[PDB]
Scaffold this active site. Sequence first.
Site, PDB file in Angstrom:
ATOM      1  N   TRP A  85      -0.788  -8.570   4.455  1.00 14.32           N
ATOM      2  CA  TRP A  85      -1.864  -7.945   5.095  1.00 14.32           C
ATOM      3  C   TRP A  85      -3.198  -8.336   4.015  1.00 14.32           C
ATOM      4  O   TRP A  85      -3.297  -7.997   2.938  1.00 14.32           O
ATOM      5  CB  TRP A  85      -1.589  -6.383   5.052  1.00 14.32           C
ATOM      6  CG  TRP A  85      -2.779  -5.636   5.584  1.00 14.32           C
ATOM      7  CD1 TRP A  85      -2.615  -5.027   6.803  1.00 14.32           C
ATOM      8  CD2 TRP A  85      -4.107  -5.125   5.261  1.00 14.32           C
ATOM      9  NE1 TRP A  85      -3.870  -4.451   7.212  1.00 14.32           N
ATOM     10  CE2 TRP A  85      -4.590  -4.296   6.171  1.00 14.32           C
ATOM     11  CE3 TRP A  85      -4.889  -5.502   4.124  1.00 14.32           C
ATOM     12  CZ2 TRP A  85      -6.023  -3.613   6.096  1.00 14.32           C
ATOM     13  CZ3 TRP A  85      -6.236  -5.010   4.051  1.00 14.32           C
ATOM     14  CH2 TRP A  85      -6.655  -4.111   4.881  1.00 14.32           C
TER      15      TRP A  85
ATOM     16  N   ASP B 128       6.099  -6.552  13.614  1.00 24.06           N
ATOM     17  CA  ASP B 128       5.005  -6.163  12.757  1.00 24.06           C
ATOM     18  C   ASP B 128       3.806  -5.377  13.628  1.00 24.06           C
ATOM     19  O   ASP B 128       3.071  -6.058  14.138  1.00 24.06           O
ATOM     20  CB  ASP B 128       4.608  -6.807  11.753  1.00 24.06           C
ATOM     21  CG  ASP B 128       4.298  -6.107  10.316  1.00 24.06           C
ATOM     22  OD1 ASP B 128       3.638  -5.252  10.705  1.00 24.06           O
ATOM     23  OD2 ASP B 128       4.382  -6.731   9.454  1.00 24.06           O
TER      24      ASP B 128
ATOM     25  N   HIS C 110       7.645  -4.127  10.179  1.00 25.22           N
ATOM     26  CA  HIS C 110       6.829  -4.409   8.959  1.00 25.22           C
ATOM     27  C   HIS C 110       7.743  -3.893   7.694  1.00 25.22           C
ATOM     28  O   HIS C 110       7.601  -4.594   6.611  1.00 25.22           O
ATOM     29  CB  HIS C 110       5.815  -3.420   9.125  1.00 25.22           C
ATOM     30  CG  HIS C 110       4.659  -3.486   7.628  1.00 25.22           C
ATOM     31  ND1 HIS C 110       4.134  -4.941   7.680  1.00 25.22           N
ATOM     32  CD2 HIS C 110       4.416  -2.802   6.806  1.00 25.22           C
ATOM     33  CE1 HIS C 110       3.343  -4.613   6.524  1.00 25.22           C
ATOM     34  NE2 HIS C 110       3.380  -3.459   5.947  1.00 25.22           N
TER      35      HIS C 110
ATOM     36  N   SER D  41       3.149  -7.015   2.072  1.00 25.23           N
ATOM     37  CA  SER D  41       1.932  -6.294   2.794  1.00 25.23           C
ATOM     38  C   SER D  41       0.749  -6.709   1.888  1.00 25.23           C
ATOM     39  O   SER D  41       0.290  -7.739   1.641  1.00 25.23           O
ATOM     40  CB  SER D  41       2.248  -5.085   3.187  1.00 25.23           C
ATOM     41  OG  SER D  41       1.338  -4.651   3.974  1.00 25.23           O
ATOM     42  N   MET D  42       0.244  -5.517   1.466  1.00 22.78           N
ATOM     43  CA  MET D  42      -1.184  -5.681   0.839  1.00 22.78           C
ATOM     44  C   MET D  42      -0.773  -6.525  -0.593  1.00 22.78           C
ATOM     45  O   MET D  42      -1.584  -7.126  -0.901  1.00 22.78           O
ATOM     46  CB  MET D  42      -1.761  -4.228   0.405  1.00 22.78           C
ATOM     47  CG  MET D  42      -2.451  -3.713   1.663  1.00 22.78           C
ATOM     48  SD  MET D  42      -3.611  -2.500   0.931  1.00 22.78           S
ATOM     49  CE  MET D  42      -3.972  -1.898   2.649  1.00 22.78           C
TER      50      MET D  42
ATOM     51  N   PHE E  60       0.924  -1.212  -0.003  1.00 23.00           N
ATOM     52  CA  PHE E  60      -0.369  -0.028   0.164  1.00 23.00           C
ATOM     53  C   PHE E  60       0.856   1.283   0.024  1.00 23.00           C
ATOM     54  O   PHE E  60       1.631   1.291   0.942  1.00 23.00           O
ATOM     55  CB  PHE E  60      -0.772  -0.096   1.250  1.00 23.00           C
ATOM     56  CG  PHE E  60      -1.856   1.147   1.394  1.00 23.00           C
ATOM     57  CD1 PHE E  60      -2.742   1.082   0.456  1.00 23.00           C
ATOM     58  CD2 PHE E  60      -1.911   1.738   2.489  1.00 23.00           C
ATOM     59  CE1 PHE E  60      -3.887   2.216   0.397  1.00 23.00           C
ATOM     60  CE2 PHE E  60      -2.723   2.803   2.572  1.00 23.00           C
ATOM     61  CZ  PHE E  60      -3.918   3.010   1.862  1.00 23.00           C
TER      62      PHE E  60
END
Length: 257
Positions: free
Chosen positions: A154, A175, A207, A129-130, A61
């Site tokens: 995520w 994280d 993270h 992540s995303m 993101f």
Amino acid sequence: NPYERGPDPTESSIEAVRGPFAVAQTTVSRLQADGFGGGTIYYPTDTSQGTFGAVAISPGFTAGQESIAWLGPRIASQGFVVITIDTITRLDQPDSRGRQLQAALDHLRTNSVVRNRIDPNRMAVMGHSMGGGGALSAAANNTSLEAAIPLQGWHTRKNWSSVRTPTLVVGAQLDTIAPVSSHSEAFYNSLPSDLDKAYMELRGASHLVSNTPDTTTAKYSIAWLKRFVDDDLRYEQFLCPAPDDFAISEYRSTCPF
């Protein structure tokens, strides 16, 4: 094994900043990319050992390719064609990133520079992540993918029981953006019990651990892609049983693969 590339591995070889394959690169413009935002393709220039599996990698993101760029040539130099992508918008959510990863893989089969360097039956997805939630989404949408590697993934989707792709979930112990208890480890627990899967937690990591070179992330991503995208048994030794690297605070798996 017709997909084995490179000499027999060691800890040094999987840790290498660059493996034995020299790497070149080519660009996909945003307009050339249907269903994603463009990307950089890294590929081995040596064609004498045959074609290679292909890997698409999504950023997270608000990020561009610059946060994942280091993975491109580090992985490609082990013998893979790797595309690091930019997304349609930096605000895209995991499901959309999953569609974009698949679109990037489909694009490699049309690209004039690399289409003849890739084995179309051997493909993988990775992401931060995303983008890691996107890797899981892409695996749920395409059960023919051979590997999926979410890094500090995520996603709002927590149930991954429909995945059939061997999946390495890499979490960061500390994280706070995608805490492992509700993201990474939750994904590991809902992936099927009969899947080849592993969860690797990086000790003390935030993270952002994937945003700059991390040897532990690279060496086990490379071993996972070799084992499952190349069916390379020579790499099973690094994955089963649990690796003892100090940098790993926890390892869970369905070993032996």
